[PDB]
Amino acid sequence: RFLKVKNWETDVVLTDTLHLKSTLETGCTEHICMGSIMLPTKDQLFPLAKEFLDQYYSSIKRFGSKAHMDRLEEVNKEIESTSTYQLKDTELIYGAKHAWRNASRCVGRIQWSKLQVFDARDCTTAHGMFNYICNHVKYATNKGNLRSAITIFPQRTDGKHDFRVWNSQLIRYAGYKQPDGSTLGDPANVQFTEICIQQGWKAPRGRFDVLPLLLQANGNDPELFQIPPELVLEVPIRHPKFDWFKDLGLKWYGLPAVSNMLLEIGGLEFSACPFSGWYMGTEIGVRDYCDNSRYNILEEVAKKMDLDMRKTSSLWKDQALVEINIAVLYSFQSDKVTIVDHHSATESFIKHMENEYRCRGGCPADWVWIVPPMSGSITPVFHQEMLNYRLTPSFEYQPDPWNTHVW
Amino acid sequence: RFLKVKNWETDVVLTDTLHLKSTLETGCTEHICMGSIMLPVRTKDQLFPLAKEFLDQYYSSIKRFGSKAHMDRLEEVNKEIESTSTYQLKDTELIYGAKHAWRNASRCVGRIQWSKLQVFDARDCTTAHGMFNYICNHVKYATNKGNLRSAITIFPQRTDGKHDFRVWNSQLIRYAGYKQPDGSTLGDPANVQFTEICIQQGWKAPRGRFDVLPLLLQANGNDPELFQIPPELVLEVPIRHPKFDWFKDLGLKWYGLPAVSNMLLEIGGLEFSACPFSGWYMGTEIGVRDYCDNSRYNILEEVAKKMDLDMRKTSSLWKDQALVEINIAVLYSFQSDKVTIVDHHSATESFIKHMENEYRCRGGCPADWVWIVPPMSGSITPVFHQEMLNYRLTPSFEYQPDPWNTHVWKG
Numbered sequence: 001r002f003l004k005v006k007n008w009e010t011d012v013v014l015t016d017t018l019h020l021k022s023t024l025e026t027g028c029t030e031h032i033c034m035g036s037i038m039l040p041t042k043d044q045l046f047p048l049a050k051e052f053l054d055q056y057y058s059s060i061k062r063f064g065s066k067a068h069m070d071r072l073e074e075v076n077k078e079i080e081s082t083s084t085y086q087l088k089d090t091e092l093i094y095g096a097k098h099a100w101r102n103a104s105r106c107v108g109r110i111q112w113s114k115l116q117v118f119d120a121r122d123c124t125t126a127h128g129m130f131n132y133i134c135n136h137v138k139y140a141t142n143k144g145n146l147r148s149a150i151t152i153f154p155q156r157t158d159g160k161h162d163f164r165v166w167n168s169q170l171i172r173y174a175g176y177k178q179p180d181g182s183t184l185g186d187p188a189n190v191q192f193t194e195i196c197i198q199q200g201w202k203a204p205r206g207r208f209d210v211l212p213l214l215l216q217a218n219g220n221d222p223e224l225f226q227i228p229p230e231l232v233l234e235v236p237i238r239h240p241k242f243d244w245f246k247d248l249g250l251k252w253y254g255l256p257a258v259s260n261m262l263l264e265i266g267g268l269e270f271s272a273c274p275f276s277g278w279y280m281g282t283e284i285g286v287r288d289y290c291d292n293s294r295y296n297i298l299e300e301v302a303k304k305m306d307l308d309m310r311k312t313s314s315l316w317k318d319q320a321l322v323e324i325n326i327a328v329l330y331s332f333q334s335d336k337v338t339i340v341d342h343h344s345a346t347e348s349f350i351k352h353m354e355n356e357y358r359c360r361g362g363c364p365a366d367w368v369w370i371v372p373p374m375s376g377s378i379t380p381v382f383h384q385e386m387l388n389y390r391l392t393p394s395f396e397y398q399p400d401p402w403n404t405h406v407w
Numbered sequence: 408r409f410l411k412v413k414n415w416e417t418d419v420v421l422t423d424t425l426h427l428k429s430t431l432e433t434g435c436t437e438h439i440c441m442g443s444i445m446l447p448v449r450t451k452d453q454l455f456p457l458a459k460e461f462l463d464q465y466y467s468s469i470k471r472f473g474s475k476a477h478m479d480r481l482e483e484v485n486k487e488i489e490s491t492s493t494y495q496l497k498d499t500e501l502i503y504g505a506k507h508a509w510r511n512a513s514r515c516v517g518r519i520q521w522s523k524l525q526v527f528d529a530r531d532c533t534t535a536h537g538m539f540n541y542i543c544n545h546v547k548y549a550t551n552k553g554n555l556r557s558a559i560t561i562f563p564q565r566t567d568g569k570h571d572f573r574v575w576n577s578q579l580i581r582y583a584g585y586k587q588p589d590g591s592t593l594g595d596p597a598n599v600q601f602t603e604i605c606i607q608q609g610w611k612a613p614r615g616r617f618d619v620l621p622l623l624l625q626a627n628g629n630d631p632e633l634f635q636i637p638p639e640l641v642l643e644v645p646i647r648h649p650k651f652d653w654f655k656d657l658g659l660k661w662y663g664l665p666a667v668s669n670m671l672l673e674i675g676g677l678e679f680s681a682c683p684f685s686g687w688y689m690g691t692e693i694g695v696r697d698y699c700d701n702s703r704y705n706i707l708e709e710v711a712k713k714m715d716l717d718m719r720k721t722s723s724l725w726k727d728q729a730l731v732e733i734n735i736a737v738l739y740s741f742q743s744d745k746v747t748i749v750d751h752h753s754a755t756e757s758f759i760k761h762m763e764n765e766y767r768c769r770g771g772c773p774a775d776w777v778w779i780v781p782p783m784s785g786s787i788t789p790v791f792h793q794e795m796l797n798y799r800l801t802p803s804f805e806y807q808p809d810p811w812n813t814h815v816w817k818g
């Protein structure tokens with residue numbers, strides 16, 4: 001019931017007790033582990049509220065205080081009466097930071113307590129959402145000195161008045177299915193680039209077009225908005241060695257801003273809660289550039305390096321992969337845009353993990369996601385045993401809106 | 408109950424039914440996943456259903472389920488269990504068992520090869536000297552002048568747990584490691600503790616950087632004895648790089664044959680505590696883990712210096728760069744000397760084909776993503792994007808505690 005995790009490079013053993021406060025489920029049973037699966041009423045509500053208020057009031061050294069009991073009473077009264085309840089700003093901020101702190105797949109959690117929370121619960125229209133999102137983008141970007149932030153739109157009431165950002169990220173590059181058969185731009189965004197083109201967007205059918213925003217307020221049909229280019233910080237990709245690298249025609253945006261997740265605090269559901277940090281270099285260079293079902297230019301880069309691409313055993317893909325990631329990092333660092341290499345971030349995470357074991361009794365972590373997509377075993381997280389479990393408040397996945405939307 | 412796995416790169420969806428035949432526990436619960444944890448005397452009472460389960464599988468595989476051969480074998484085993492409190496496998500059952508143990512090894516990426524295993528029955532062995540002979544023959548057969556062949560040698564099963572056969576070496580061939588007074592290590596830091604035992608047992612250490620460790624062999628529960636593998640049986644490969652000529656002067660080499668020797672083979676409730684098996688290396692085992700793990704030979708630094716890399720910021724990825732060239736050199740050296748090896752691109756691609764075949768022909772393929780994905784360049788291999796299900800099937804290879812921690816000393 002008290003679990004120990006071992007690091008095999010250092011022999012350090014940590015003891016986990018925090019898992020015992022887990023409430024949601026893993027998908028795993030005693031007979032089968034699903035660790036590598038990517039996507040595993042008034043009476044429901046009060047225990048959920050109680051649990052949260054209990055941990056909130058504990059965090060401020062006022063468990064079993066009049067205020068705590070008062071608040072529990074007030075919330076209880078609101079629930080029976082109104083069929084939902086409203087979070088105080090302090091609770092909203094606490095809940096958002098803890099949803100990040102609890103994100104078992106996030107390697108960047110050492111930064112969890114420094115999150116700027118934007119209360120957008122007074123928003124009523126897509127134009128309102130656009131304004132809030134522009135402000136978020138401007139604030140988070142900070143001329144390249146990136147700052148973590150989240151903007152929270154009104155909570156679900158009854159499933160018919162959902163606020164939803166249809167984009168998966170605030171800033172992404174378009175992708176179009178051509179008649180030649182291949183693909184122009186970002187292959188991940190093909191179906192989405194289509195729906196924009198459908199919904200009225202004029203695609204400049206190019207390769208690196210910043211997608212428009214598709215915003216759904218109060219359950220209504222979604223609306224297109226172009227983000228002001230001066231708010232979209234982009235980074236030209238060059239190599240500190242291959243002068244031919246710039247000729248490839250590659251750039252990327254500085255702000256990773258995930259916008260399709262659901263934020264759960266005290267039983268309440270926030271279906272629209274875009275949040276942003278800054279990139280780990282491998283997200284762009286390994287996944288975004290060199291994945292097959294993405295920009296997939298490993299082949300092209302190796303060509304210009306004149307590597308032997310006849311046999312896989314020359315490791316030309318590995319050689320190219322590294323140089324590319326050197327460039328991404330180089331380009332961002334030159335342009336003074338915040339970025340972290342996977343060696344620094346994983347080192348940071350080990351320290352965060354030990355801090356959390358020390359001050360909280362645990363840190364839920366998903367090894368499958370925490371270990372970087374290149375050079376895994378030369379990073380410290382590879383030899384670190386992790387325990388994965390679901391704590392609340394939390395970020396959850398939700399279905400794409402188009403599959404769901406009652407038009 | 409059916410379970411689906413999806414490949415996020417191809418959108419191929421497979422359906423698993425095999426997991427229903429799973430018995431052993433994972434460690435996980437609906438409250439927690441222990442998927443990243445490395446390592447989370449048997450009464451006749453529980454032995455018979457284990458034997459029956461195995462015999463049912465066996466006679467199904469040969470299309471004789473419910474046959475008189477099946478039923479008589481069942482009765483024969485039953486009687487032997489209530490009489491002698493254990494039983495003996497036929498050679499045929501033993502070979503099936505060992506092959507299926509490998510087929511069931513969820514952490515093994517090389518399983519496309521599972522049906523080609525040479526099984527050596529060493530169950531008539533009684534002494535450490537006999538163990539040395541069987542192991543020598545295994546090494547010679549498996550090495551095959553560089554044309555490696557998968558093999559397993561199986562020593563007598565456990566009885567009361569007081570007469571165990573054990574190979575104390577973690578692998579049949581490994582380099583010594585010596586802790587120096589100044590805190591630095593000579594040779595392989597992974598083998599320091601074992602090297603000490605050997606030395607204590609009477610081994611005269613050459614105290615070099617690449618000394619092949621002696622075999623420490625325990626028969627029938629007696630104290631282990633030291634043997635030297637004839638050096639002509641240990642095929643080794645000098646490591647050089649195809650473009651960097653200074654690489655040879657690092658003085659590196661590695662042995663050709665990976666032969667894991669500390670695992671326990673379980674078949675039908677029987678436990679074979681000494682069952683050394685061998686295949687061939689995936690390049691990253693040597694070049695990423697053996698050479699570049701900070702807790703092993705750890706030569707990234709010296710390789711990086713000689714490459715004249717920007718070693719100041721990690722963000723130069725000097726570690727990643729050196730890691731690649733080292734792995735190129737390992738593959739190059741082995742191919743050039745015509746010693747069997749496989750790169751991680753080839754091996755993972757083959758595993759995907761194997762896994763798809765297993766889903767079709769068998770209903771599933773237990774796989775441990777944490778172990779299947781290679782320790783470098785993970786996402787540019789096809790296994791990275793593959794959902795996998797992990798569960799435990801028998802026959803199986805299990806971990807067991809190091810023998811020096813459990814052995815009752817005779818004198």
Ligand code: HEM
Pocket residue numbers: 100103105106107108109111115148149150275276277278279280283340345369395
């Ligand atoms: C500030 C620097 C940050 C860094 C370096 C970072 C890094 C990462 C990385 C590399 C991943 C894996 C994502 C992938 O491979 O697709 C990830 C996942 C994730 N991050 Fe962080 N992140 C940061 C900030 C944040 C913030 C501010 C939040 C929330 C407020 C957050 C919440 C999450 C969540 C929920 C996931 C998992 C998403 C999923 O389950 O699919 N991260 N992060």
Ligand code: HEM
Pocket residue numbers: 509512514515516517518520524557558559684685686687688689692749754778804
């Ligand atoms: C023939 C070529 C083979 C290749 C290329 C191969 C590859 C691998 C690799 C790379 C690992 C991960 C090891 C690590 O990183 O520590 C592994 C694990 C494993 N292999 Fe295979 N293998 C082969 C043959 C075999 C054979 C012949 C057997 C048994 C008869 C076997 C049984 C296992 C088992 C039980 C594990 C799990 C080890 C553990 O749980 O610690 N493999 N294999």
Ligand SMILES: NCc1cccc(OCc2ccc3ccc(N)nc3c2)c1
Pocket residue numbers: 256258260261276277278279280283
């Ligand atoms: N890959 C599937 C999928 C679906 C939905 C969200 C998601 O999250 C990826 C993600 C989430 C948050 C991040 C925060 C910062 C960052 N640099 N990357 C981040 C990447 C991933």
Ligand SMILES: NCc1cccc(OCc2ccc3ccc(N)nc3c2)c1
Pocket residue numbers: 517577665667669685686687688689692
């Ligand atoms: N690292 C923990 C540990 C402890 C004991 C054995 C072991 O085996 C790893 C292993 C097992 C079988 C293998 C078969 C072939 C091969 N090339 N490598 C292989 C590597 C691993």
Ligand SMILES: C[C@H](O)[C@H](O)[C@H]1CNc2nc(N)[nH]c(=O)c2N1
Pocket residue numbers: 008382383384385386443444445777778779780
């Ligand atoms: C903590 C983690 O379980 C441990 O370091 C594992 C990770 N994956 C691995 N994968 C392979 N193939 N071999 C290993 O030794 C390990 N070590």
Ligand SMILES: C[C@H](O)[C@H](O)[C@H]1CNc2nc(N)[nH]c(=O)c2N1
Pocket residue numbers: 036037038368369370371415791792793794795
């Ligand atoms: C099949 C597998 O679960 C899938 O490819 C996962 C693996 N690990 C990952 N790890 C991170 N950080 N991000 C990812 O998108 C994925 N994808």
Ligand SMILES: [Zn+2]
Pocket residue numbers: 028032033034035435436439440441442
């Ligand atoms: Zn699990």
